[PDB]
Amino acid sequence: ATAILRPIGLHVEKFQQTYRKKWRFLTSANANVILAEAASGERPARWALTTGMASIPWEYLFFYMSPAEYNRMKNYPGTFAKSASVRIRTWNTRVAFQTGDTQTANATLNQNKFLQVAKGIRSIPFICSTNRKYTYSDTEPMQPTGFATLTSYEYRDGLKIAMYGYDNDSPDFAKKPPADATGAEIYLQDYLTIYTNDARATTGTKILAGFPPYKNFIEEFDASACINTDVVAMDYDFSYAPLVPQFAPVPNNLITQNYNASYPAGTKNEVTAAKTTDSSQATPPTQVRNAPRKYIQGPNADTTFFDEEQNYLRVPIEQGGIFEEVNVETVHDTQMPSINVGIRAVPKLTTIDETTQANSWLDAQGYFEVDCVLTTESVDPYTYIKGGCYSANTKSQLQYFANDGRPIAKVYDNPNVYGRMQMIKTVKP
Amino acid sequence: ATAILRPIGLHVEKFQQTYRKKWRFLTSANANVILAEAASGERPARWALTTGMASIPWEYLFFYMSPAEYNRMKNYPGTFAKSASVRIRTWNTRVAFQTGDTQTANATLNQNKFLQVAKGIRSIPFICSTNRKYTYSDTEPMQPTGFATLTSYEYRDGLKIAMYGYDNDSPDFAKKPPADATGAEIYLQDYLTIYTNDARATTGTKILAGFPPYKNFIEEFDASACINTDVVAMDYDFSYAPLVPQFAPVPNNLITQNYNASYPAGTKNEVTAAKTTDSSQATPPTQVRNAPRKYIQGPNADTTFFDEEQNYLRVPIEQGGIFEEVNVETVHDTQMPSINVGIRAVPKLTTIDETTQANSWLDAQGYFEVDCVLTTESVDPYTYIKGGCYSANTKSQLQYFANDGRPIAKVYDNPNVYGRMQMIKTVKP
Amino acid sequence: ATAILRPIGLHVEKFQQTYRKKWRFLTSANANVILAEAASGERPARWALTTGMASIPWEYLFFYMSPAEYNRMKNYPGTFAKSASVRIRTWNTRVAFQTGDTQTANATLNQNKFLQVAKGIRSIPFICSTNRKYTYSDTEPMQPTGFATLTSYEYRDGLKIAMYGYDNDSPDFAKKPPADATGAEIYLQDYLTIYTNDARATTGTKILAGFPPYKNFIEEFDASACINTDVVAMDYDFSYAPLVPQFAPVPNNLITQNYNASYPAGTKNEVTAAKTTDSSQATPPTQVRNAPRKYIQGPNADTTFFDEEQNYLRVPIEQGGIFEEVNVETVHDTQMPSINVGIRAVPKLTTIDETTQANSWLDAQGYFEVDCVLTTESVDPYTYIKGGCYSANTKSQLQYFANDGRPIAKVYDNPNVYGRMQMIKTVKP
DNA sequence: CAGGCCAA
DNA sequence: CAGGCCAA
DNA sequence: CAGGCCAA
């Protein structure tokens, strides 16, 4: 029989988009100096071990796509980031010929020059670390002497403005020529810092374990041999990275009296759970099903996360475990591996009189060429004849929310807990 | 060494039974007419799109096995339905030679004649549909003009009585000669209906998406070429279809003081959970472990579901996710695919003066031969020497119950929620 | 480029240890006699069917390793039992030449001599059984006439003292020469007992199912043909058998303000749950996530289980489902199969006048050579430069605890519930 | 040698 | 082209 | 023919 009709199904349009950027970064060869961080509120007193390995913010959307691209992508509901790849090439590493201390003849033609590469240090359960901006001494510009108050949000915002510049109506427009237009180098200021407990004021049983041997977890090469060579090549497939929420479905509550029905989930977990842990061991690990959350499209939608655009530079691209879909789903926790590259500090040719680390360093810069590609996909489903696009209600998305109404999102800024990136309340920009 | 004894284990007797029926169904080629359904209580105002695709009740036990077989199967505890298969063959489709409107000469030898087949429309998340009985206009017998109050339970009971007849003591015995004895055709009256929201009285943001293009999800063939041809051939393996509860185990509480003990389930879910969802998006999806339930055999058994025989025609055969077993079990939600077949309405040869759908249709009937087979299995375990059959306590079964004591069961009558059949309270017959 | 550094990671030292013992056991051919056990508190009145199959305590640590080895293993934190294997060889089985009843000439050269082997009877859901010590009649030394009050803890302690002897300062030192030094035979006194309900005082619907046919689940061989032959050869890989807790990690709460953070678990269960069941069917099976528990190392450690050394002879080696680790973990319930071996009772050559079981038995002993091997592994992780060994915080372990502070552990002493070994509160030694 | 721990 | 969503 | 049920 001639089939006059056949189940061709819905009309769905899938769009794949690619975002590419090229960035040139200058990195300081910061010395390895212990800095004291005083206790503040819930933060204990700790020792900080500074490094010269600059953080590469490849986990954020501004790294791959310009404000124009971001604004246009906003008009594509259902957009998911598919894969993010970054390639880092280092160029000739400059080392100061002399320290500038006139009282010594330390100038020399010879250089020992090492490049440090750190993949996934952020996820190591026992190396408590985060990326920090330092303040430096005037006599020794390469020696950290404290911490800048610049937060991670402010750092990434400043880096974005250096990448793309100001708006034409900005009075400060001339200050930052866009590196996306010029191709000029950008100074990085956000470096890996290793922390350990400070037991000087600790009462009771002190932990006196020193630092973890973090140099056993990084790669280091002779930077003289690495000129114009690829040093980092990492791809990442996103588990769940909703950049724009799905098209809202036609609400079945307007058609059906069964919208609030119940059905068996069996032994499968179709609702995600939040795990709370306590490294102080005052409380056992806790798993709580049905965390507070609300839809990011539909009649009672709360789109604060996507209207505050947390996902451009404040919050990492991948948010697996933060977002639920209303269907039989498998959801796991997610992390993007951290990338830190830098030059080891070059000691001065002075001769110190004691068996210890060098106390004076030559100025040295790492020159890193960064190639980054981001792939995204969006959908245009037509479940209904009129009224525009509508998705299936099984494509409805929820986002974890705090009880005060602030969206909860993954953050890569704080140190890991048991190798996990925490979920934290988003802050209104 | 000569083994005088070896672990031969228990004596268990497994019985496999087959139930076959042949039914001949007559289907009306109902027109596609929009019907208004006024809001009633929790049901909103909606538009109904009528079709001529008659529902095939292959998900119910009366479809395969007669009252005598059902009554005998009651005496086989531990009976599970294993597989249900249905084969549908269509015969010559009759179309009225003339409409009967004397004021027109619409009689014609020529016919355009189409058969519609719909598999799994009930499970489509975005096509809100259910099977309904219509009322028809007198001048146009093939045009629905409303809904009959006949419910799904009443419809399936009437169809069962048409299939098998009354008891010999019934005063109305002569009214329904059994089709199981005669082989005569039975008129089907339960047709697929597509629903959409009615926004005439809607206050606020209206959804004006019209209807979903449901004809993109059905098969249609020239019925003139389908004479004596198989059109539906579907098999279904039941995940969990307990027709008669297991043999009750010997209660360990009469032998042991450890009967109320606790043991680790680990990270496995050995207890099922009920998922509550809200398409109005007023409440997030909720998963609740340890839903109220009670045993269907044993000292505190509640056998209301199996004594009210919900499972004959009121409730579908498969109840996966409704029934728990006391052991390490994997349980998932279950659905039987819906089958709707019918003839598209044949327009009258009159010439209408406006660009629109036909307003008059010829009488047309689909002639469908239905072959159905049901396979069941039961067990006779002898854990003990005396007293009759007893099963292992790991074979104990629980059924979900509401707090008022009404058994909860799966139903295929209401429209799907996120592609799921709901669980609802059973009603006492 | 020449890599001056590469990620060699941590220094971790793994130590594998082997523990071997050889034991010679003498088993009585106890008669199959029904014993009444009166109701006591929560324990109902029941009938007990005695057997001669002696329990082999291969599930406990004292079976494989001496007090010196146990005390030294205490100084290896992070020790897990890996595998336990037992080989049982039976030697010539002695049968009394005569019963000693002078009023009969029952002495005979001829013997019918059978060896009974029972693997995994403890896990059978419908055979409610446990191992018991009997009291015997004076005229018939092989006939049980009651139960000794000796508990399982006391039995295993006495067997341990027979295996290894007393301390040199003990006044009772001469009473028990160590079998680990002498190689002498040890009399076993702990035999499989089959239970069934006693309905003499039962009010209401009585269960009169008799006994389960337990002889359909054991192996039996002609013991005359089994002289110097292997009869049991069983290996067991432990799922989780922590003998000494891990090295405590450096507490991140002393370094980080994020220690009490939350992260998504997704749909995975990273926290174990305890399943409570009710064979009386008064309560449905219940699964409870986040059972009370506390760490076995770290700042708030509760090491009562490992300081009371429950794991030497009071509690079985494997405790899977009792112990949690703070990470994405898969945990399941665990059981070690039971081993019971013995000689069937040899009837007297007297002629009884009634059709029934023999009422007099010859003395018979089983001679069983038991070879047992236990493999354990421990770790020495160095996450930090100073202060000694520290593990990753993902290696932190928690143990289930009751609300009163008593550690919860698996026990193989009580009869199974739905084929599961229960978790019970440990008792302070 | 990276992505929900590593000593798997 | 059906069975716990389909645009997987 | 044993290890989270066996009649899978």
| C160 SS3 class | helix
Q: In angstroms, how far is F5 C1' from B139 CA? A: 64
> Which residue in the set C207, C213, C418 is minimally distant from B393, CB to CB?
C418
Closest by CA position to B414, among listed A278, A410, A178, A257: A257
Identify the closest residue of chain A to C327 by CA–CA distance.
A418
Closest by CA position to C250, among listed C414, C62, C389, C66: C389
> Which residue in the set C253, C262, C270 is minimally distant from A422, CB to CB?
C262
The DSSP symbol for C297 reads S
Is C85 in contact with C373 (CB distance < 8 Å)?
yes
Q: Residue B336 CB closer than 7 angstroms to strand E?
A: yes
DSSP strands (E only) in A293-425: 293-295, 323-325, 339-343, 346-347, 361-362, 364-382, 397-400, 408-410, 423-425
Give the ranges where A272-363 is alpha helix by DSSP (H).
Answer: 304-307
> Which residue in the set B42, B284, B320 is minimally distant from A257, CB to CB?
B42
Taking the C1' atom of every nucleotide in all shown strands and the CA of A7, the nearest one is E1
| A290 SS3 class | coil
| C87 SS3 class | strand
Distance from CA of C126 to the nearest CA of A (A): 25
Q: In angstroms, how far is D3 C1' from B403 CA? A: 45
Q: How many CB pairs under 8 A join A and C?
A: 228
Is B85 in contact with B373 (CB distance < 8 Å)?
yes
Q: In angstroms, how far is D7 C1' from C331 CA? A: 19
Asked if C262 lies within 8 A of A274 by C-beta distance, the reply is yes
Q: Give the tokens for residue B249.
A: 């185990």
| C-beta within 7 A of nucleic chain F, residues 114-133 of C | 119-120, 122-125
Phi/psi for C152 (5° steps) reads -65, -40
Which residue is closest, via its CA, to the C1' of F3? C335
Q: Residue C337 CB closer than 7 angstroms to strand F?
A: yes
Asked if B384 lies within 8 A of C210 by C-beta distance, the reply is yes
β-pairing verdict for A34-37 and A323-325: unpaired
| Concatenated DSSP letters of A203-247 | -SS--------GGGGSEEEEGGG-TTEEEEEEEEE-SS-BSSPPP
| C-beta within 7 A of nucleic chain F, residues 17-76 of C | none
Which residue is closest, via its CA, to the C1' of F4? C333
Q: Which residue has the tokens 């057997």?
A: C51
| Concatenated DSSP letters of C195-206 | EEE--SS--SS-
Distance CA C315, CA C319 (A): 9
Asked if C386 lies within 8 A of A209 by C-beta distance, the reply is yes
Chains sharing 3 or more CB pairs under 8 A with chain B: A, C
> Which residue in the set C251, C255, C266 is minimally distant from A332, CB to CB?
C266
Distance from CA of A257 to the nearest CA of B (A): 4
Closest by CA position to B28, among listed B238, B272, B191: B191
Q: Chain F: nucleotides under 7 Å from a protein CB?
A: 1-8
Exposure of B9 by Cβ count < 10 A (0-12 exposed, 13-18 middle, 19+ buried)?
exposed
Cβ-Cβ contacts under 8 Å for A351 (sequence gap 6 or more): none
Q: Which helix (H) or strand (E) holds C344?
A: none
Cβ-Cβ contacts under 8 Å for A281 (sequence gap 6 or more): C251, C294, C295, C298, C299, C300, C301, C396
Q: Which helix (H) or strand (E) holds A334?
A: none
Asked if B398 lies within 8 A of C285 by C-beta distance, the reply is yes
Contacts of residues A100-105 at CB distance under 8 Å and 24 or more positions apart, as own/partner, are A101/A348, A101/A350, A101/A360, A104/A348, A104/A349, A104/A350
**How far is CA C124 from its chain centroid?**
16
Distance CA B324, CA C275 (A): 14
Identify the closest residue of chain A to B127 by CA–CA distance.
A383
Distance CA C380, CA C10 (A): 10
Cβ-Cβ contacts under 8 Å for C343 (sequence gap 6 or more): C27, C28, C29, C52, C93, C113, C114, C115, C116, C223, C364, C365, C366
> Which residue in the set B284, B285, B331 is minimally distant from A267, CB to CB?
B331
Is B425 in contact with B414 (CB distance < 8 Å)?
no
| A179 SS3 class | helix
Distance CA A207, CA C254 (A): 9
| C45 SS3 class | coil
Cβ-Cβ contacts under 8 Å for A294 (sequence gap 6 or more): A300, A301, A302, A398, A399, A401, B281, B284
Q: Chain D: nucleotides under 7 Å from a protein CB?
A: 1-8
Q: In angstroms, how far is F8 C1' from C171 CA? A: 58
- Resolution in Å, one decimal, please: 2.7
β-pairing verdict for A114-119 and A219-222: antiparallel
Q: Which helix (H) or strand (E) holds A130?
A: strand A129-132
Identify the closest residue of chain C to A240 by CA–CA distance.
C266
Chains sharing 3 or more CB pairs under 8 A with chain C: A, B
Q: In angstroms, how far is D3 C1' from B365 CA? A: 61
Q: Chain E: nucleotides under 7 Å from a protein CB?
A: 1-8
Contacts of residues A3-9 at CB distance under 8 Å and 24 or more positions apart, as own/partner, are A3/B219, A3/B220, A3/B221, A4/B114, A4/B220, A4/B221, A4/B222, A5/B116, A5/B215, A5/B218, A5/B219, A5/B220, A6/B219, A6/B220, A7/B216, A7/B217, A7/B218, A7/B219, A8/B216, A9/B216, A9/B217
**How far is CA A236 from its chain centroid?**
13
Distance CA B367, CA B254 (A): 60
DSSP strands (E only) in A223-363: 229-237, 262-266, 273-276, 286-289, 293-295, 323-325, 339-343, 346-347, 361-362
β-pairing verdict for A185-187 and B408-410: unpaired
| Concatenated DSSP letters of C268-286 | S--S-EEEE--TTSSS--E
Distance CA B392, CA A392 (A): 45
Q: In angstroms, how far is D8 C1' from B226 CA? A: 61
Taking the C1' atom of every nucleotide in all shown strands and the CA of A85, the nearest one is D2
Q: Sheet harboring C408-410: ordered strands across?
A: C286-289, C273-276, B262-266, C423-425, C408-410
Q: Residue A298 CB closer than 7 angstroms to strand E?
A: no
Contacts of residues C208-211 at CB distance under 8 Å and 24 or more positions apart, as own/partner, are C208/B386, C208/B387, C209/B250, C209/B383, C209/B384, C209/B385, C209/B386, C209/B387, C209/B388, C209/B390, C210/B384, C210/B385, C210/B386, C210/B387, C211/B384, C211/B385, C211/C47, C211/C49
Interior angle at CA B228, CA B226 and CA B230, nearest 5: 75
Which residue is closest, via its CA, to the C1' of D1? C7
Taking the C1' atom of every nucleotide in all shown strands and the CA of C3, the nearest one is D1
Q: Which residue has the tokens 């549909």?
A: B129
| C231 SS3 class | strand
Distance from CA of C11 to the nearest CA of B (A): 31
**How far is CA A96 from its chain centroid?**
32
- Residue A147: Cβ within 10 Å count: 15
Q: In angstroms, how far is E5 C1' from B419 CA? A: 7
Exposure of A2 by Cβ count < 10 A (0-12 exposed, 13-18 middle, 19+ buried)?
exposed
Chains sharing 3 or more CB pairs under 8 A with chain A: B, C
Distance CA C111, CA C94 (A): 10
Q: Which helix (H) or strand (E) holds C159?
A: helix C152-164
**In three state form, how does the secondary structure of chain B look?**
CCEEECCCCCEEEEEEEEEEEEEEEEEECCCCCEEEECCECCECCEEEEEEEEEECCCCCHHHCCCHHHHHHHCCCCCCEEEEEEEEEEECCCEECCCCCCCCCCCCCCCCCCEEEEEECHHHCCCCCEEEECEEECCCCCCCEEEECCCCHHHHHHHHHHHHHCCCCCCCCHHHCCCHHHHCCEEECCCEEEEEEECCCCCCCCCCCCCCCCHHHHCEEEEHHHCCCEEEEEEEEECCCCECCCCCCCCCHHHCCCCCCCEEEEECCCCCCEEEECCCCCCCCCEEEECCCEEECCCCCCCCHHHHCCCCCCCCCCCCCCCEEECCCCCCCCCCCCCEEEEECCEECCCCCCCCCCCCCEECEEEEEEEEEEEEEEEEEEECCCCCCCECCHHHCEEEEECCCCCEEEECCCCCCECCECCEEECCCC
Exposure of B227 by Cβ count < 10 A (0-12 exposed, 13-18 middle, 19+ buried)?
middle
Give the technique used to solve this structure: cryo-EM
The DSSP symbol for A124 reads -
Closest by CA position to A112, among listed A187, A219, A221, A27: A221
Closest by CA position to C250, among listed C71, C10, C81, C5: C10
Distance from CA of A366 to the nearest CA of C (A): 16
Is B409 in contact with B323 (CB distance < 8 Å)?
no
